[PDB]
Structure formats: structure tokens, C-alpha cells
Amino acid sequence: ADIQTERAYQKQPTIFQNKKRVLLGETGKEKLPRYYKNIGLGFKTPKEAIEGTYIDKKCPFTGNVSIRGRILSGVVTKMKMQRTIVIRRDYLHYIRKYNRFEKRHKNMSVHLSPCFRDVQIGDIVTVGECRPLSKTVRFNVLKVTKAAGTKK
């Protein structure tokens, strides 16, 4: 229940939820000794990851997914895909003949670990490239901002 919303059992790998024969109730206070890692490039692992109980293999903190290569920002545009968001990166493309630019918008499907709550849309969101992890998705969200305009 709650966490196991799937047909197979979901567990973090890399921990053995079993070794126990001592007093003071069944298991500890934290109960399951949670796996997590830090992602580096001075991206702060969230509390919602380490304190949090969920699991997600594609979470760049609490699962198998190295972050590597390109890092960007977008802005959250659609949240409807489960565990993922489309984000709009916008840029000014130079034509030379006319010594001017044009708007251009590539919109990347992006993995969004459930460590992040309170991600509204219109929310600038840093993403770090990774190995592919869906037909279209390579980029996980790493830090989120929201404050451009509406509220904390």
C-alpha cells in the first residue's frame, strides 16, 4: 500500500531490507535504511529524497542515474506525463543577412523525480543531461526555482 502501487514489488536496490533479530520492536525508528546519493556539481540533495520514502530508479538522487555532460534550464510547461514534465527552452537564433535574430523554442520531455513537490508550471527548472531513459527523455530535473512571478 501507498508506495507499492505496482504489480511487482518496488524497492530501492542496494539495500537489504531484512537483517534483524534484536529487542526494541520490529525494525528501527527510520525502519527501512534509505539509499541515496549526492549528484554533485554543487546540486544539493533534497530533504524530500533522503527523508522521503518513495522510490524511483530514474531519480538522480535515489536511484541508478548518473548526471553527465550538458546542464541546462527550461521552464515547466506541461506536467501530465507520470514522473515527467515537458519544458520549454527558448532562444534567439541569428540570421546573418538580416542582422537580427528570431525566437525559437525546443521543448524537451524531462524526467521529474517525485522528490520535487510544489513544482507549479511556469517554473524555471535546471536539468542535467543523463543516459537515455525513455524514447524521448534524457534530462532529469536537478534543481527547481518557481519564484519568477507568483509567490514562494
Binding site: 554533485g40 556539481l41 553527465r68 555532460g69 546542464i71
Partner: protein
């Protein structure tokens, strides 16, 4: 490309081989080896283009195959064996012995050296290891998996390897105030002491290097390669000293040599 490639067009060849347009459609293409194809002096070129020791392809073959040439102390009958940076080529029936150390253009100057000196070489450590049963390793820049290093070397330190025995005989640590040659890109074959290193996490590390004659530059760590402690280096250096005249200064030095000296 149904598999691998077994040829190399002239023109498509490395620029620093000095290989001219009309002569042939092809260049040798170094054999697979310790150094990277596009970082070599294919033994043939080193001879019949740069020592004029052979005339043809055939004449190099015949020089090579009397077991005359001895590349970092062994013997090699491949004409396309990639010799390269901080190697030797001992040629014996003459007692020449060279090194292949870069020119301030970036061409491997035919640099004659003494038979003492021709014992040791120098190497950059690429990666330190730990293999099975805890036994650590190095890997040199030129594919010498050394085993059991002085637990201190770590990557980018340069070593003075013996050659004939093999194995490390003391070393230099990559730090500020150490003589740094660069082995790549724009500043190829320049030499100055370091000054300053800048770690960019994920990107790669830019490194500054100040020349003896006041001039400065930067690079990306990979190409960099130390050759001693501060001003004094641990090897011979070709005349020029890796110091990089401006094109104006070079023209002046060419002009001054002419007319006056004779």
C-alpha cells in the same frame, strides 16, 4: 565503412609530418601502437623524410630490417611503428640516438642526444589503478602498465622510467612551479613553468603556463606534461628551448643571421 580502415590519404595525413602534395596519394598510416595515429612520427617518415637516411619506401624497409633501429630500447621491424613524444629511437651503427621532442612550431625536432640520457625516458601518468589482490598500477602516456608505483604518484605526475629494466626511477609531481611542456593544440611544444591551474568540475581543467621570456598562455590539462622542477628540467631541450618567437621576431632573427654571420 564496413569494418576498420587500412589506409591513409596524403593530405588527410597529419600536418606536422611535412608530407608534400605530389609524391603519392597516400601517407603511411602509423601502425596501431602506444601513441595515437594523429600524434606520431611513423618510423619511415622519421628516416627517409627527416634524416634523408633512406631514399624510398624500400630503402627504409632495408634499414629497418637489418635490426638497426631500436625504438625505446627493443628493436622494431615495422616501418610504420608510431614513435612519438619522449621516446628515443637508438640507431646504433652510427651511435646517433634521438628523442622526438616537439618544436615550437610543433613538428618533433630531430633532436640528437647522448648515449647516457638515451637510457631513461619520461612519461605522463594517465591513470592509477589498483588491480587484483590490491596491487596498484600506473599507466603511462605511451601504454606502459607499470605495477607497484611509489604511493604518491597520481594522475598527471611525470615519471623517469628506466627503459631496459623498465620500472620507475623517481618522478615529478604536477604542481605550480614545475616545467611544463604542452603536447597539443595551439601551444604545442611551448615550455614554461606552470603558475596556475583551474579545476572546472565536469568540464576540463584549464592550466596557465608562463614562458621564461615573460610570455604567458593557457591550455587544457591533457596536452600538458611536466619535465622537471622549476626552470631546470630533467631532460635535454632542442635549441629554441620551446620559447615561441613572434613571426616578426623570427623574421628579425633570420635577417640578423643572414649577411652578418658567415
Amino acid at each position: 565503412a564496413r569494418g576498420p580502415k587500412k589506409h591513409l590519404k596524403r593530405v588527410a595525413a597529419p600536418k606536422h609530418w611535412m608530407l608534400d602534395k605530389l609524391t603519392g596519394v597516400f601517407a603511411p598510416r602509423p601502425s596501431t601502437g602506444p601513441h595515437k595515429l594523429r600524434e606520431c612520427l611513423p618510423l619511415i617518415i622519421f628516416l627517409r623524410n627527416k634524416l634523408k637516411y633512406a631514399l624510398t619506401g624500400d630503402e627504409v624497409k632495408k634499414i629497418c630490417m637489418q635490426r638497426f633501429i631500436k625504438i625505446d630500447g627493443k628493436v622494431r621491424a615495422d616501418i610504420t611503428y608510431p614513435a612519438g613524444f619522449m621516446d628515443v629511437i637508438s640507431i646504433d651503427k652510427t651511435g646517433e640516438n634521438f628523442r622526438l621532442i616537439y618544436d615550437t612550431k610543433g613538428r618533433f625536432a630531430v633532436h640528437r642526444i647522448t648515449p647516457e640520457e638515451a637510457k631513461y625516458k619520461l612519461c605522463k601518468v594517465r591513470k592509477i589503478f589498483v588491480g587484483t589482490k590490491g596491487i596498484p598500477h600506473l599507466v603511462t602516456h605511451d601504454a606502459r602498465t607499470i605495477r607497484y608505483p611509489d604511493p604518491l604518484i597520481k594522475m598527471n605526475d611525470t615519471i623517469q622510467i628506466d627503459l631496459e629494466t623498465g620500472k620507475i626511477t623517481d618522478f615529478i609531481k604536477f604542481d605550480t612551479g614545475n616545467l611544463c611542456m604542452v603536447t597539443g593544440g595551439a601551444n604545442l611544444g611551448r615550455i614554461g613553468v606552470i603558475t596556475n591551474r583551474e579545476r572546472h568540475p565536469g568540464s576540463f581543467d584549464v592550466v596557465h603556463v608562463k614562458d621564461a621570456n615573460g610570455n604567458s598562455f593557457a591550455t587544457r590539462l591533457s596536452n600538458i606534461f611536466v619535465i622537471g622542477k622549476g626552470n631546470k628540467p630533467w631532460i635535454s631541450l632542442p635549441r629554441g628551448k620551446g620559447i615561441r618567437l613572434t613571426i616578426a621576431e623570427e623574421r628579425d632573427k633570420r635577417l640578423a643571421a643572414k649577411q652578418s654571420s658567415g
